[PDB]
Design a protein around this nucleic acid. Structure first.
Lengths: 260, 67, 177, 145
RNA sequence: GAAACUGCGAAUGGCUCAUUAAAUCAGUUAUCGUUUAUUUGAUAGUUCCUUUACUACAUGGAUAUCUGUGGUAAUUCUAGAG
RNA sequence: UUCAUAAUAACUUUUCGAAUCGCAUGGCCUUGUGCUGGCGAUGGUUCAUUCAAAUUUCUGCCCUAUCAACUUUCGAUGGUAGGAUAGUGGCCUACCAUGGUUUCAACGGGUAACGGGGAAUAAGGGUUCGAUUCCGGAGAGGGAGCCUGAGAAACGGCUACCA
């Protein structure tokens, strides 16, 4: 009761942050923004714990003030901005570009993108609604609203964005026999080609999905995210390529793959 | 043994970014002498009591002696 | 008892002590914000026209006007009406306060002195103190000197030259707007 | 379950923001509007041809059906435009490895299109808070003789 | 740049288990039954009211801080004027 | 969907529609101190999104018959019509209708009862505990009542009465 809550205890924080149990009572609450509390990833975790440049949160505040971080083009000097899925993080010093794509386990991966391709962002829909003066405007699932779309763009259809200028480039339709990423639940950070869709009467849609190894799995509709034609990825993907392996298969690889 | 060393580029860069207590131990910057935690906390409360400034109340001190 | 006298035009104030009752008996049954003659008060003031508007009580109860009665009635106060400085924005506080009409209970009486009389006293009507702060805004500096538009500004500014010991550097306001 | 009188109140009742045009000439007189309930249901013609208004009716009103679709047999009938569905079920007991039988009743609002009696199955859908206890509305009466 | 005016925060954190037995609570739902500072996104030619003498090249007066005149056995009590 | 949105008819003691400020001082001159122009702050209207907040569907609780009938004057259960509310609702009134829960244990009593995630013991089943490091809910000596703010019946804020 009584207003909002402006704290987060460390055990109560979500697990895919990969914070320590010891060496701290609290965890960094990500502020309000285009991504939700669970699905986001704050910049304290990215700089301190992932890249491992800064030793503690003190030194993250020094880097932001002078002054090369650029989430989706613009700067952001906030320590806990909710940076999430398909967001581009660049650095002019070191010439490094990144993208927050999910790992086969479910964690956020440190994926080094080309200069170059870090330039367009991929987002989803959402609405699909008219404003005043009969103006059609589209909304992105990952934050923004964009104006004047193509007449044939509908729900669950992905859209490419210019990032620097902020306009529509291209779109893909949600149909059978196309690549699709998963961003929610147990089958998180997997890629597949789609087969069937059970529509249902006001009780959540489902999708049956294969992969290159011919292994079937089922997921909800809202977790699903389109990613181009089959065997034709629009975005560069990390090693693994959303296959997901057995326990005993991964044991076979590590002890075999040796070379000091 | 296993340390944890940091080699900066220059002197002016290494002075500002490194914590103040680390500059004291090597003998780079001066040691910042300050008041004790108890007495400056009392100063905050006593400063709050008088709406202030100290001029108006001090001039009344001469007048209050006559009463 | 004490009389808080203050001349508005000249800008000088002084407390006059009165032990005698007969001098204060003119103010008996008179309300806050009315004109009073100087001759009936005493020998010091003759020809003056006093202006009673305010007061003070024994123990320490500042008098508020519009209350009526010769009584100490506790009132509910807030931001908008006097006899209370709020610390929290919107908070109220029930304060004690002295009534309006004057009796034999007071320590000090508030008095403004409009018109002069005969005996100009030491440093209440003789001396004339200038006002501390000068003008500032665009049309306050214009109307004080009677300039209008085409005369322009950046001319009629007070530059006080204070000296620590050797130097005599200037200060200056900042004409906003 | 009054019923029949059409208008018999202190006030008068009409469908809100639906107008009978005075100057225009047609057989209608009474101007009816009716809604499609959705979820693969079928709206009867007793609602379309009828004279009742009802604020709380899902066919002719602002009451939108959403959420869950329960069922069960009818028991109580003796008040104006509501019904009490008795919904029987089992409950587990891990200690003995057996089952129970439990009771609690479900109150619901009836549309005057549907004709209801005691001891008949009634499919029922969730809606806005209609009243104190009644949170549901009737969508079927499949009384097999 | 002390002091005070304006804005923001002080409704979070911390502590305790007195009340409470379909209440609280746990898992599942719906808000097509409503409010939301802050957040990052978009976004306002339409106020003129007959269209030949209308503030729009920029309008008004206070109030603080401080100058002083105080009362009080008392307290972050606040009265008079400039 | 009486949804999004658009049009006609007017209303309103007519909300808003920038009288705000720092670091730079450029470009063609209609060479005025004018017509244009860079880099960031701030405020603003409706529609989104986020942080949330309100109510709400379904199933689940420890003993007691030396508690078998219980609620409806003073709203109990339902209908119509208003009032209030940020918004639904007997939440509140007016005129009606007599309903609702009950041996599948209501209603009353007791708890040395805050609810869960859990802990203790350990063939399999189960017994007993959970004030307490995480999540949700109550309360600031006991009861009512409000002001300011987007958000408070706030208590390291206020107005009473009883200690």
């Amino acid at each position: 009761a009584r207003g909002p809550k402006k704290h987060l205890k460390r055990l109560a924080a979500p697990h895919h942050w990969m914070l320590d149990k010891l060496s701290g009572c609290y965890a960094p609450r990500p502020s309000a923004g285009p991504h939700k509390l669970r699905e986001s990833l704050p910049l304290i975790v990215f700089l301190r714990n992932r890249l491992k440049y800064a030793l503690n949160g003190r030194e993250v505040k020094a880097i932001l003030m002078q002054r090369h971080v650029k989430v989706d083009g613009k700067v952001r000097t906030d320590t806990t901005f909710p940076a999430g899925f398909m967001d581009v993080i660049t650095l002019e010093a070191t010439n490094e570009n990144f993208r927050l794509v999910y790992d086969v386990k479910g964690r956020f991966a440190v994926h080094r993108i080309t200069d170059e391709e870090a330039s367009y962002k991929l987002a989803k829909v959402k609405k699909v609604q008219l404003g005043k003066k009969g103006i059609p405007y589209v909304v992105t699932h990952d934050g923004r609203t964009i104006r004047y779309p193509d007449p044939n763009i509908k729900v669950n259809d992905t859209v490419k964005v210019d990032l620097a200028t902020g306009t529509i480039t291209d779109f893909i339709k949600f149909d059978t026999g196309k690549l699709v990423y998963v961003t929610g639940g147990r089958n998180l950070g997997r890629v597949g080609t789609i087969v069937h869709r059970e529509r249902h009467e006001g009780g959540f849609d489902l999708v049956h999905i294969k992969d290159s190894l011919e292994n079937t799995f089922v997921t909800r509709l809202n977790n699903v995210f389109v990613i181009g034609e089959p065997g034709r990825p629009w975005i560069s993907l990390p090693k693994g390529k959303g296959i997901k392996l057995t326990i005993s298969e991964e044991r076979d690889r590590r002890r075999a793959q040796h070379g000091l | 043994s296993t340390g944890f060393g940091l080699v900066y580029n220059s002197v002016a860069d290494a002075k500002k970014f490194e914590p103040a207590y680390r500059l004291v131990r090597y003998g780079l910057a001066e040691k910042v002498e300050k008041a004790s935690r108890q007495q400056r906390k009392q100063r905050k409360n006593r400063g709050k009591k008088i709406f202030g400034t100290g001029k108006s109340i001090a001039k009344k001190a001469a007048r209050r002696n006559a009463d | 008892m004490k009389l808080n006298i203050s001349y508005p035009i000249n800008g000088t104030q002084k407390c006059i002590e009165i032990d005698d009752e007969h001098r204060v008996r003119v103010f008996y049954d008179k309300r806050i914000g009315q004109e009073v003659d100087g001759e009936s008060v005493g020998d010091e003031f003759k020809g003056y026209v006093f202006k009673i508007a305010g007061g003070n009580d024994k123990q320490g109860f500042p008098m508020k006007q519009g209350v009526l009665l010769p009584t100490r009635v506790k009132l509910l106060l807030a931001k908008g009406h006097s006899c209370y400085r709020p610390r929290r924005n919107g908070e109220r506080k029930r304060k004690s306060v002295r009534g309006a009409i004057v009796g034999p209970d007071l320590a000090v009486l508030a008095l403004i002195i409009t018109k002069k009389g005969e005996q100009e006293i030491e440093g209440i009507t003789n001396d004339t103190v200038p006002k501390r702060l000068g003008p500032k805004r665009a049309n306050n500096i214009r109307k004080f000197f009677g300039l209008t538009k085409e005369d322009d500004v950046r001319d009629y500014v007070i530059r006080r030259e204070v000296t620590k010991g050797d130097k005599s550097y200037t200060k200056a306001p900042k004409i906003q707007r | 379950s009054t019923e029949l009188t059409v208008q018999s109140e202190r006030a008068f009742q009409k469908q809100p923001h639906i107008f009978t045009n005075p100057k225009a000439k047609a057989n209608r007189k009474t101007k009816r509007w009716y809604k499609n309930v959705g979820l693969g249901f079928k709206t009867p013609k007793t609602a379309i041809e009828g004279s009742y208004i009802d604020k709380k009716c899902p066919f002719t009103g602002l009451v939108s059906i959403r959420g869950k679709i329960l069922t069960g047999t009818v028991v109580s009938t003796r008040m104006h435009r509501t019904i009490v569905i008795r919904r029987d079920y089992l409950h587990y007991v891990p200690k003995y490895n057996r089952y129970e039988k439990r009771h609690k009743n479900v109150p619901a609002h009836v549309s005057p299109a549907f004709r209801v009696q005691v001891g008949d199955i009634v499919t029922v859908g969730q809606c806005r808070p209609i009243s104190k206890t009644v949170r549901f509305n009737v969508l079927k009466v499949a009384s097999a003789t």
